[PDB]
Amino acid sequence: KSSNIYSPFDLKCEFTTNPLGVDKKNPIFSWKLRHLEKNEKQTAYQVIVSSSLETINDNIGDVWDTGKVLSSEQVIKYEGKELEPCKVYFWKVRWWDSKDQESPFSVVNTFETGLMNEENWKAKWITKKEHKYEVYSPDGAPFGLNYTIAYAPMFRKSFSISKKIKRARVYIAGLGLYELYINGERIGDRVLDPGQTDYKKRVLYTVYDVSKNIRDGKNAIGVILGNGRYVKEYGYDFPKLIIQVLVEYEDDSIEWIVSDESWKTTYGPITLNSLYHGEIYDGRKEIKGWNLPDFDDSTWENAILAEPPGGKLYSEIYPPIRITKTIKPIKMWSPEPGTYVYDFGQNYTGWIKIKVRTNESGKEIRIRHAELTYEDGTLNYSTNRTALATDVYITKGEGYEEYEPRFTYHGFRYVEILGYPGVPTLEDIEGKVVHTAVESNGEFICSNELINKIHHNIIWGQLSNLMSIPTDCPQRDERMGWMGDAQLSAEEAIFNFDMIGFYRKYLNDIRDAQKENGSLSDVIPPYWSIYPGDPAWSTAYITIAWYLYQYYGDKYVLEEHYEGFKKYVEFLKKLAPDYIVSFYKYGDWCQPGTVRPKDNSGELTSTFYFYHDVITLSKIAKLLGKEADYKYYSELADKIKSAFNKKFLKEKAYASMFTSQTLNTLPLYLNLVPEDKVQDVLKTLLEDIIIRHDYHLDTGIVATRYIFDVLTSYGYDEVAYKIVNQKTYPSFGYMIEEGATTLWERWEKLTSTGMNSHNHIMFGSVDAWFYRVIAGVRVGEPGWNKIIFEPHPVGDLKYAKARLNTIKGEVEINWQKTENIFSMRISVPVNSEGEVHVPKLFERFVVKEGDNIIYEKKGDLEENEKYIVIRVGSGSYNFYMEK
């Protein structure tokens, strides 16, 4: 009817295409837009939700009909009829462009509700009664802990089907890990399910579609339990199981099979299983045919009732852990007879798959994993520390067998195999990359190859540390959800991967661990109880939440956790009666040549985050309309600045020779420096960088996240580029020159036990600088409502590009620098505006919008003596600054 010929596309419920198991009573709906014309923006939308396909195809609001909603937002909270469990809903949406031209309806999408807030689960928790375990107590555990490793119980139940099915659903929560089978076939496309949470406060169950798996006559289901994080050392019990199998027939009748004492159970091939120490698979004790209809279900002991884990059973929509890739080894050698070592060329996470040909039964094959190597060619397991990280497979002798671990994962680059039946090849080993299967959100490429290698190392390091929770390292006896490392690298992960579903689940984990006084643990989930938290660590609650609103435009996650923000800031106010939080544990963690900060900056870093937490909370309060809370925090923020400067500002620099880089970038980032002192404080920072350190970082994980932006904001991007381009200690290039395929925990090359891990993510915040400064695409208004295209062609850079897939669509920036022409090509999606910042690198120039000249003299466009400002709408544009 109109010129608005394109309906909304990529419709997401809970930020997922057609989600299965929506437990949120008010889920989040989103969509992207596309128009034929430029400078287009949504002015109105209307979403219809119905209860049937025939019903939705009549443009009627069976359970929701917003009507023409006059709003430019494309991320909405559900406000329709109260949703009901196990029901499938349908929804389309229309949008009105900038000229009120109505668009056709979108393609009918679908979201299915799960059990919906424990709506009479009927099924009960089942377990074995014997439960054989082993108590491993190695010398040197982190806090002196022990490891109680139980076995792997299997659970079987048979049911019969006669009338033909319409649909089938399965709602399982196997603690701590599980694998589901129906009539012999594996069900899930995920591994290491469910996600790690505080099982005493919440247990995330998974729902599967097992319709085309039901068969006719006799049926069988199979569940094998792994330990994972549900272990006695963290305050949990032995593995338990709950599961209910909804089955719907074509006659609109329902029956289902629940977990009870009628279930049989036994021990199978898997003995001990642990995330830190690996898994043992004895093929001789493998019950052949255990999960198929016609099977002697007797001779097994019956399951018993379990004490529930205590947590509410919820179903969050977030990316699960999957086998994301299969890599093949590149090199193999033998440092000792019978020992064969593989090199994958990259430090990654997961496990391996081995192919064996033995015919003889009972032969043991031991698979060890490590991050580093020794000069003699043997593996260095030092970075793994007390984590055994070895898998053992005992062959059956069937001429050809394959094995992959199912209840563990390791972080490694090399693999040692002892006991192989002969000489193995590069085909008999298959590496499985295992982590949270996040989608790719952005690309980045540079003219500098060292920067590309650093960017390549951070991408693998971040994915290596995404196991349903943001971890610090993935290789040793830790892998905890440290709040500080997750906060400093949150901006990088958002730029590289789709993280809104991941962070929404993690933000709940922080909410589930917040104490009554507002305290937070340094690791979340609090398997290790560290209360209270460091301010530089506990800031991850408000920071990650603010990131979700800044880069996705999700103001609802700000209201959902607002009371938690007010409670934590209240706790920080308790530690700061006179405004200087003297309490700190880590501070600027791991400065060059140290673990604890050498500049005694912990109290400055702590007060830095006290002002940070109060300022952004007052910014959130003003957004939600809380004028009283806004003014209050705004006033309190002023108290801090003034108290921060009274205690730390010393004539020409900050202190407590006598001033470090960390001591100066932090007040310059949040702009706590008085205007009469910024030029002198900034100079102390530059002289410490250029003169005292010769363009080298002297900062830990906290200040490294801010130092590059501080120099860029004050017109010193050349100094920041010279820091990045360093190949000597201490720098990111020094890691690459020493053979790092990921990022190190420490600047120094350390290959022994102790904090020497080679796959950390806390220092990965520099990848955000590559996108926002080197490439030059940053958020101007939340949700990418305004985009700032400000490239920084520094050093000997010739080209750079960042292409992002945001919540509004595709965002792209490209620039080329020659002696005469500076090219620039940007792309702005519909319902967004662009603000180009063409840098004036020439005394006289032209500036051409394609073939159209748009700047002959001063005054043709906006400028600020450093840039040329161009404001555009949606579409692709090419700008040419010549001469």
PDB file of C-alpha atoms in Angstrom, residues 563-784:
ATOM      1  CA  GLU A 563      16.944  -2.376  44.075  1.00  0.00           C
ATOM      2  CA  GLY A 564      20.096  -4.499  44.041  1.00  0.00           C
ATOM      3  CA  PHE A 565      22.073  -1.475  42.865  1.00  0.00           C
ATOM      4  CA  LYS A 566      20.662   0.704  45.650  1.00  0.00           C
ATOM      5  CA  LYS A 567      21.493  -1.996  48.200  1.00  0.00           C
ATOM      6  CA  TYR A 568      25.112  -2.466  47.106  1.00  0.00           C
ATOM      7  CA  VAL A 569      25.761   1.283  46.957  1.00  0.00           C
ATOM      8  CA  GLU A 570      24.244   1.426  50.446  1.00  0.00           C
ATOM      9  CA  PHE A 571      26.837  -1.130  51.560  1.00  0.00           C
ATOM     10  CA  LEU A 572      29.643   0.869  49.945  1.00  0.00           C
ATOM     11  CA  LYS A 573      28.414   3.939  51.835  1.00  0.00           C
ATOM     12  CA  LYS A 574      28.816   1.923  55.041  1.00  0.00           C
ATOM     13  CA  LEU A 575      32.485   1.272  54.233  1.00  0.00           C
ATOM     14  CA  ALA A 576      32.879   4.998  53.433  1.00  0.00           C
ATOM     15  CA  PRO A 577      31.550   7.076  56.339  1.00  0.00           C
ATOM     16  CA  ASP A 578      34.076   9.787  55.441  1.00  0.00           C
ATOM     17  CA  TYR A 579      34.008   8.960  51.713  1.00  0.00           C
ATOM     18  CA  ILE A 580      37.355   7.227  51.265  1.00  0.00           C
ATOM     19  CA  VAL A 581      36.914   3.452  51.068  1.00  0.00           C
ATOM     20  CA  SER A 582      40.177   2.293  52.629  1.00  0.00           C
ATOM     21  CA  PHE A 583      39.175  -1.369  52.261  1.00  0.00           C
ATOM     22  CA  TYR A 584      40.638  -3.191  49.265  1.00  0.00           C
ATOM     23  CA  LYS A 585      42.019  -6.646  48.519  1.00  0.00           C
ATOM     24  CA  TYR A 586      43.175  -6.632  44.882  1.00  0.00           C
ATOM     25  CA  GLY A 587      43.060  -3.099  43.481  1.00  0.00           C
ATOM     26  CA  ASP A 588      45.190  -2.662  40.363  1.00  0.00           C
ATOM     27  CA  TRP A 589      45.775  -6.405  40.153  1.00  0.00           C
ATOM     28  CA  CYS A 590      49.003  -7.611  38.512  1.00  0.00           C
ATOM     29  CA  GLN A 591      50.969  -4.525  37.608  1.00  0.00           C
ATOM     30  CA  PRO A 592      54.257  -5.267  35.796  1.00  0.00           C
ATOM     31  CA  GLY A 593      56.587  -7.038  38.194  1.00  0.00           C
ATOM     32  CA  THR A 594      54.110  -7.526  41.038  1.00  0.00           C
ATOM     33  CA  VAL A 595      50.825  -9.055  42.156  1.00  0.00           C
ATOM     34  CA  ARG A 596      49.713  -6.489  44.737  1.00  0.00           C
ATOM     35  CA  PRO A 597      49.926  -2.862  43.538  1.00  0.00           C
ATOM     36  CA  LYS A 598      53.344  -1.268  44.012  1.00  0.00           C
ATOM     37  CA  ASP A 599      52.028   2.316  44.138  1.00  0.00           C
ATOM     38  CA  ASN A 600      49.752   1.774  47.179  1.00  0.00           C
ATOM     39  CA  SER A 601      46.823   2.743  44.953  1.00  0.00           C
ATOM     40  CA  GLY A 602      44.260   0.300  46.354  1.00  0.00           C
ATOM     41  CA  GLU A 603      42.430   2.980  48.335  1.00  0.00           C
ATOM     42  CA  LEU A 604      42.445   5.242  45.259  1.00  0.00           C
ATOM     43  CA  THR A 605      41.157   2.454  43.008  1.00  0.00           C
ATOM     44  CA  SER A 606      38.487   1.656  45.618  1.00  0.00           C
ATOM     45  CA  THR A 607      37.291   5.254  45.900  1.00  0.00           C
ATOM     46  CA  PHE A 608      37.478   5.458  42.100  1.00  0.00           C
ATOM     47  CA  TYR A 609      34.836   2.724  41.896  1.00  0.00           C
ATOM     48  CA  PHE A 610      32.816   4.198  44.768  1.00  0.00           C
ATOM     49  CA  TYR A 611      32.408   7.386  42.737  1.00  0.00           C
ATOM     50  CA  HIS A 612      31.870   5.227  39.644  1.00  0.00           C
ATOM     51  CA  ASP A 613      29.080   3.196  41.254  1.00  0.00           C
ATOM     52  CA  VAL A 614      27.278   6.277  42.585  1.00  0.00           C
ATOM     53  CA  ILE A 615      27.555   8.320  39.375  1.00  0.00           C
ATOM     54  CA  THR A 616      26.152   5.623  37.086  1.00  0.00           C
ATOM     55  CA  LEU A 617      23.435   4.809  39.631  1.00  0.00           C
ATOM     56  CA  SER A 618      22.361   8.458  39.613  1.00  0.00           C
ATOM     57  CA  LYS A 619      22.404   8.190  35.815  1.00  0.00           C
ATOM     58  CA  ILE A 620      20.166   5.112  36.009  1.00  0.00           C
ATOM     59  CA  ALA A 621      17.866   6.836  38.509  1.00  0.00           C
ATOM     60  CA  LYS A 622      17.340   9.802  36.183  1.00  0.00           C
ATOM     61  CA  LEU A 623      16.587   7.399  33.320  1.00  0.00           C
ATOM     62  CA  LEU A 624      13.831   5.612  35.256  1.00  0.00           C
ATOM     63  CA  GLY A 625      12.346   8.886  36.533  1.00  0.00           C
ATOM     64  CA  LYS A 626      13.428   8.643  40.193  1.00  0.00           C
ATOM     65  CA  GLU A 627      14.133  12.344  40.711  1.00  0.00           C
ATOM     66  CA  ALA A 628      14.738  11.957  44.453  1.00  0.00           C
ATOM     67  CA  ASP A 629      17.197   9.104  43.937  1.00  0.00           C
ATOM     68  CA  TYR A 630      18.779  11.021  41.115  1.00  0.00           C
ATOM     69  CA  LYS A 631      19.472  14.107  43.101  1.00  0.00           C
ATOM     70  CA  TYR A 632      20.590  12.167  46.121  1.00  0.00           C
ATOM     71  CA  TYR A 633      23.267  10.221  44.322  1.00  0.00           C
ATOM     72  CA  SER A 634      24.294  13.138  42.321  1.00  0.00           C
ATOM     73  CA  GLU A 635      24.904  14.998  45.556  1.00  0.00           C
ATOM     74  CA  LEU A 636      26.761  12.098  47.014  1.00  0.00           C
ATOM     75  CA  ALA A 637      28.942  11.797  43.979  1.00  0.00           C
ATOM     76  CA  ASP A 638      30.006  15.340  44.497  1.00  0.00           C
ATOM     77  CA  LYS A 639      30.963  14.446  47.991  1.00  0.00           C
ATOM     78  CA  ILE A 640      33.378  11.803  46.730  1.00  0.00           C
ATOM     79  CA  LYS A 641      35.146  13.771  44.037  1.00  0.00           C
ATOM     80  CA  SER A 642      35.845  16.512  46.590  1.00  0.00           C
ATOM     81  CA  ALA A 643      36.952  13.952  49.181  1.00  0.00           C
ATOM     82  CA  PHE A 644      38.913  12.047  46.520  1.00  0.00           C
ATOM     83  CA  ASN A 645      40.853  15.200  45.614  1.00  0.00           C
ATOM     84  CA  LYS A 646      41.447  16.311  49.207  1.00  0.00           C
ATOM     85  CA  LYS A 647      43.228  13.023  49.991  1.00  0.00           C
ATOM     86  CA  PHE A 648      45.008  12.240  46.704  1.00  0.00           C
ATOM     87  CA  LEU A 649      45.587  15.419  44.666  1.00  0.00           C
ATOM     88  CA  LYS A 650      49.170  16.565  45.397  1.00  0.00           C
ATOM     89  CA  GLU A 651      49.965  19.866  43.656  1.00  0.00           C
ATOM     90  CA  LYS A 652      51.005  18.331  40.321  1.00  0.00           C
ATOM     91  CA  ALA A 653      49.882  14.675  40.447  1.00  0.00           C
ATOM     92  CA  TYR A 654      48.037  12.062  42.502  1.00  0.00           C
ATOM     93  CA  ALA A 655      49.745  10.057  45.245  1.00  0.00           C
ATOM     94  CA  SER A 656      49.239   8.437  48.646  1.00  0.00           C
ATOM     95  CA  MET A 657      58.852   8.596  41.682  1.00  0.00           C
ATOM     96  CA  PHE A 658      55.862   9.199  43.973  1.00  0.00           C
ATOM     97  CA  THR A 659      53.190   8.843  41.252  1.00  0.00           C
ATOM     98  CA  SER A 660      52.343   5.893  39.010  1.00  0.00           C
ATOM     99  CA  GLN A 661      50.356   5.558  35.804  1.00  0.00           C
ATOM    100  CA  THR A 662      47.525   3.871  37.719  1.00  0.00           C
ATOM    101  CA  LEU A 663      47.390   6.830  40.119  1.00  0.00           C
ATOM    102  CA  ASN A 664      46.738   9.293  37.272  1.00  0.00           C
ATOM    103  CA  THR A 665      44.618   7.613  34.571  1.00  0.00           C
ATOM    104  CA  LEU A 666      41.819   6.813  37.032  1.00  0.00           C
ATOM    105  CA  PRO A 667      40.914  10.380  38.157  1.00  0.00           C
ATOM    106  CA  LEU A 668      41.478  11.538  34.559  1.00  0.00           C
ATOM    107  CA  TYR A 669      39.011   8.943  33.236  1.00  0.00           C
ATOM    108  CA  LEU A 670      36.030   9.959  35.389  1.00  0.00           C
ATOM    109  CA  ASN A 671      37.337  13.566  35.245  1.00  0.00           C
ATOM    110  CA  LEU A 672      37.877  14.093  38.964  1.00  0.00           C
ATOM    111  CA  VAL A 673      40.856  16.394  38.310  1.00  0.00           C
ATOM    112  CA  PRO A 674      40.165  20.101  38.943  1.00  0.00           C
ATOM    113  CA  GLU A 675      40.185  22.146  35.748  1.00  0.00           C
ATOM    114  CA  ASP A 676      43.191  24.140  37.007  1.00  0.00           C
ATOM    115  CA  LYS A 677      45.209  20.906  37.318  1.00  0.00           C
ATOM    116  CA  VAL A 678      44.278  18.698  34.340  1.00  0.00           C
ATOM    117  CA  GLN A 679      47.124  19.947  32.138  1.00  0.00           C
ATOM    118  CA  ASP A 680      49.692  19.247  34.862  1.00  0.00           C
ATOM    119  CA  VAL A 681      48.305  15.875  35.972  1.00  0.00           C
ATOM    120  CA  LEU A 682      48.003  14.668  32.373  1.00  0.00           C
ATOM    121  CA  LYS A 683      51.621  15.688  31.733  1.00  0.00           C
ATOM    122  CA  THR A 684      52.818  13.598  34.684  1.00  0.00           C
ATOM    123  CA  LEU A 685      51.061  10.638  33.064  1.00  0.00           C
ATOM    124  CA  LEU A 686      52.638  11.289  29.653  1.00  0.00           C
ATOM    125  CA  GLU A 687      56.139  11.721  31.088  1.00  0.00           C
ATOM    126  CA  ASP A 688      55.789   8.514  33.107  1.00  0.00           C
ATOM    127  CA  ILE A 689      54.746   6.738  29.902  1.00  0.00           C
ATOM    128  CA  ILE A 690      57.234   8.266  27.465  1.00  0.00           C
ATOM    129  CA  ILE A 691      60.270   9.127  29.596  1.00  0.00           C
ATOM    130  CA  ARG A 692      60.140   6.774  32.578  1.00  0.00           C
ATOM    131  CA  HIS A 693      58.763   3.722  30.748  1.00  0.00           C
ATOM    132  CA  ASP A 694      59.474   4.311  27.020  1.00  0.00           C
ATOM    133  CA  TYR A 695      55.872   3.734  25.877  1.00  0.00           C
ATOM    134  CA  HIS A 696      55.129   0.778  28.142  1.00  0.00           C
ATOM    135  CA  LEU A 697      52.230  -0.035  30.442  1.00  0.00           C
ATOM    136  CA  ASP A 698      52.867   0.225  34.191  1.00  0.00           C
ATOM    137  CA  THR A 699      49.265  -0.644  35.043  1.00  0.00           C
ATOM    138  CA  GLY A 700      47.328  -3.645  36.299  1.00  0.00           C
ATOM    139  CA  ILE A 701      44.036  -5.016  35.051  1.00  0.00           C
ATOM    140  CA  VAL A 702      42.008  -2.048  36.336  1.00  0.00           C
ATOM    141  CA  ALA A 703      44.013   0.868  34.939  1.00  0.00           C
ATOM    142  CA  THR A 704      44.834  -0.874  31.643  1.00  0.00           C
ATOM    143  CA  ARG A 705      41.104  -0.761  30.863  1.00  0.00           C
ATOM    144  CA  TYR A 706      41.120   3.055  31.161  1.00  0.00           C
ATOM    145  CA  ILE A 707      44.613   4.185  30.125  1.00  0.00           C
ATOM    146  CA  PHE A 708      44.087   3.901  26.361  1.00  0.00           C
ATOM    147  CA  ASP A 709      40.826   5.867  26.452  1.00  0.00           C
ATOM    148  CA  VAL A 710      42.349   8.558  28.688  1.00  0.00           C
ATOM    149  CA  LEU A 711      45.181   9.337  26.262  1.00  0.00           C
ATOM    150  CA  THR A 712      42.781   9.197  23.306  1.00  0.00           C
ATOM    151  CA  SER A 713      40.270  11.569  24.914  1.00  0.00           C
ATOM    152  CA  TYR A 714      42.956  14.188  25.632  1.00  0.00           C
ATOM    153  CA  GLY A 715      44.327  14.193  22.083  1.00  0.00           C
ATOM    154  CA  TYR A 716      47.257  11.799  22.591  1.00  0.00           C
ATOM    155  CA  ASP A 717      46.233   8.784  20.514  1.00  0.00           C
ATOM    156  CA  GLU A 718      49.768   8.534  19.093  1.00  0.00           C
ATOM    157  CA  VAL A 719      51.133   7.659  22.543  1.00  0.00           C
ATOM    158  CA  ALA A 720      48.516   4.933  23.004  1.00  0.00           C
ATOM    159  CA  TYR A 721      49.300   3.424  19.596  1.00  0.00           C
ATOM    160  CA  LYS A 722      53.028   3.349  20.386  1.00  0.00           C
ATOM    161  CA  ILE A 723      52.213   1.464  23.593  1.00  0.00           C
ATOM    162  CA  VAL A 724      50.215  -1.170  21.698  1.00  0.00           C
ATOM    163  CA  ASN A 725      52.857  -1.566  18.962  1.00  0.00           C
ATOM    164  CA  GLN A 726      55.482  -2.589  21.548  1.00  0.00           C
ATOM    165  CA  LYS A 727      56.979  -6.073  21.213  1.00  0.00           C
ATOM    166  CA  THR A 728      59.063  -5.920  24.415  1.00  0.00           C
ATOM    167  CA  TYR A 729      58.258  -6.286  28.095  1.00  0.00           C
ATOM    168  CA  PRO A 730      55.803  -5.257  29.308  1.00  0.00           C
ATOM    169  CA  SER A 731      53.218  -5.327  26.506  1.00  0.00           C
ATOM    170  CA  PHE A 732      50.695  -7.489  24.695  1.00  0.00           C
ATOM    171  CA  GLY A 733      53.156  -7.895  21.830  1.00  0.00           C
ATOM    172  CA  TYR A 734      55.674  -9.439  24.217  1.00  0.00           C
ATOM    173  CA  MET A 735      53.128 -12.186  24.917  1.00  0.00           C
ATOM    174  CA  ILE A 736      52.735 -12.895  21.196  1.00  0.00           C
ATOM    175  CA  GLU A 737      56.501 -12.887  20.622  1.00  0.00           C
ATOM    176  CA  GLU A 738      56.795 -15.507  23.393  1.00  0.00           C
ATOM    177  CA  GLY A 739      54.290 -17.864  21.761  1.00  0.00           C
ATOM    178  CA  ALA A 740      50.960 -16.859  23.315  1.00  0.00           C
ATOM    179  CA  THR A 741      47.839 -17.790  21.363  1.00  0.00           C
ATOM    180  CA  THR A 742      45.675 -16.238  24.096  1.00  0.00           C
ATOM    181  CA  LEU A 743      46.312 -13.660  26.821  1.00  0.00           C
ATOM    182  CA  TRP A 744      48.415 -14.222  29.931  1.00  0.00           C
ATOM    183  CA  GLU A 745      47.497 -13.637  33.555  1.00  0.00           C
ATOM    184  CA  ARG A 746      50.776 -11.769  34.160  1.00  0.00           C
ATOM    185  CA  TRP A 747      52.962  -9.537  32.008  1.00  0.00           C
ATOM    186  CA  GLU A 748      56.050 -11.613  32.824  1.00  0.00           C
ATOM    187  CA  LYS A 749      56.624 -14.955  31.119  1.00  0.00           C
ATOM    188  CA  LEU A 750      55.983 -17.439  33.937  1.00  0.00           C
ATOM    189  CA  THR A 751      55.710 -21.200  33.420  1.00  0.00           C
ATOM    190  CA  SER A 752      55.541 -22.610  36.954  1.00  0.00           C
ATOM    191  CA  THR A 753      52.855 -23.228  39.549  1.00  0.00           C
ATOM    192  CA  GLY A 754      51.121 -20.266  41.115  1.00  0.00           C
ATOM    193  CA  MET A 755      49.386 -17.392  39.374  1.00  0.00           C
ATOM    194  CA  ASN A 756      51.067 -18.096  36.013  1.00  0.00           C
ATOM    195  CA  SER A 757      48.091 -19.020  33.826  1.00  0.00           C
ATOM    196  CA  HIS A 758      48.322 -18.488  30.066  1.00  0.00           C
ATOM    197  CA  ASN A 759      44.629 -18.033  29.202  1.00  0.00           C
ATOM    198  CA  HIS A 760      43.273 -15.072  31.168  1.00  0.00           C
ATOM    199  CA  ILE A 761      40.758 -12.492  29.971  1.00  0.00           C
ATOM    200  CA  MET A 762      41.112  -9.628  32.478  1.00  0.00           C
ATOM    201  CA  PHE A 763      43.734  -7.868  30.339  1.00  0.00           C
ATOM    202  CA  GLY A 764      41.577  -8.271  27.203  1.00  0.00           C
ATOM    203  CA  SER A 765      39.906  -4.858  27.506  1.00  0.00           C
ATOM    204  CA  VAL A 766      42.246  -3.474  24.827  1.00  0.00           C
ATOM    205  CA  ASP A 767      40.141  -5.131  22.121  1.00  0.00           C
ATOM    206  CA  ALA A 768      37.424  -2.583  22.897  1.00  0.00           C
ATOM    207  CA  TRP A 769      39.951   0.161  22.128  1.00  0.00           C
ATOM    208  CA  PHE A 770      40.547  -1.360  18.682  1.00  0.00           C
ATOM    209  CA  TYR A 771      36.847  -1.049  17.818  1.00  0.00           C
ATOM    210  CA  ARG A 772      36.056   2.380  19.271  1.00  0.00           C
ATOM    211  CA  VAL A 773      39.309   4.257  18.490  1.00  0.00           C
ATOM    212  CA  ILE A 774      41.468   2.514  15.864  1.00  0.00           C
ATOM    213  CA  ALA A 775      38.483   1.522  13.736  1.00  0.00           C
ATOM    214  CA  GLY A 776      36.391   4.320  15.215  1.00  0.00           C
ATOM    215  CA  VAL A 777      32.819   3.179  15.909  1.00  0.00           C
ATOM    216  CA  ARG A 778      31.401   3.962  19.357  1.00  0.00           C
ATOM    217  CA  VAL A 779      27.966   4.287  20.923  1.00  0.00           C
ATOM    218  CA  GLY A 780      26.675   7.855  20.877  1.00  0.00           C
ATOM    219  CA  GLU A 781      23.294   7.142  22.452  1.00  0.00           C
ATOM    220  CA  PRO A 782      22.170   3.930  24.184  1.00  0.00           C
ATOM    221  CA  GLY A 783      20.937   1.125  21.972  1.00  0.00           C
ATOM    222  CA  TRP A 784      23.069   2.523  19.124  1.00  0.00           C
TER     223      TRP A 784
END
